[PDB]
Amino acid sequence: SFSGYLKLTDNVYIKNADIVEEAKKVKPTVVVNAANVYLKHGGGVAGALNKATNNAMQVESDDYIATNGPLKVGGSCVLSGHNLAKHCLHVVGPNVNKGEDIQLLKSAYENFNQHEVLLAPLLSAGIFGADPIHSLRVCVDTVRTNVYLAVFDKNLYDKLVSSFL
Ligand SMILES: c1nc(N2CC[C@@H](n3cncn3)C2)c2cc[nH]c2n1
């Protein structure tokens, strides 16, 4: 099970960790990917998860897109978790660097409520351009299921914990 997490609320937990290493250790039922609408896993969390699957996540994702078309910003899809988890919940947060509306971040976190427990990154943070402090606030105010947040960057983790409330 999940270990070394700081408890933020009744249902939200956080740890300074690489979500790939966390997924490989815990083998959670669900790992969340910080996806884009095309499921093109090039960088950030998506590029790291995909590389850990030896590109099997991208091969599966290209078949999904060929059949279904792109996701909506704020939407999600459930695909295989490969060697990392039972399932991967690909969630698209708004990318502020591409000009998407930050109000879609709450819709993105609502996808987590369809799963009892999840290992996840902060949505729209990193290369997506949003303020991670805002992202954690939206996560805590939107997700009601048990979410274990892995924050890769130690300096950001400390800033998030010391400013939480
Ligand atoms: C958790 N979060 C991650 N990320 C969050 C936004 C993004 N980033 C940008 N600066 C700091 N981190 C990537 C990653 C990347 C690999 N493994 C991870 N585990």
From Swiss-Prot:
It comes from the Viruses. Inhibited in vitro by GRL-0617. This is Papain-like protease nsp3. May form homohexamers. Interacts with N protein. It catalyses: Thiol-dependent hydrolysis of ester, thioester, amide, peptide and isopeptide bonds formed by the C-terminal Gly of ubiquitin (a 76-residue protein attached to proteins as an intracellular targeting signal). Changing residue 29 to A: In strain: Mu/B.1.621. Responsible for the cleavages located at the N-terminus of the replicase polyprotein. Participates together with nsp4 in the assembly of virally-induced cytoplasmic double-membrane vesicles necessary for viral replication. Antagonizes innate immune induction of type I interferon by blocking the phosphorylation, dimerization and subsequent nuclear translocation of host IRF3. Also prevents host NF-kappa-B signaling. In addition, PL-PRO possesses a deubiquitinating/deISGylating activity and processes both 'Lys-48'- and 'Lys-63'-linked polyubiquitin chains from cellular substrates. The chain holds residues 1027 to 1191 of 7096 of the full protein. Residues 1-165 form the Macro domain. It is found in: Host endoplasmic reticulum membrane. It is a multi-pass membrane protein. The gene is rep.
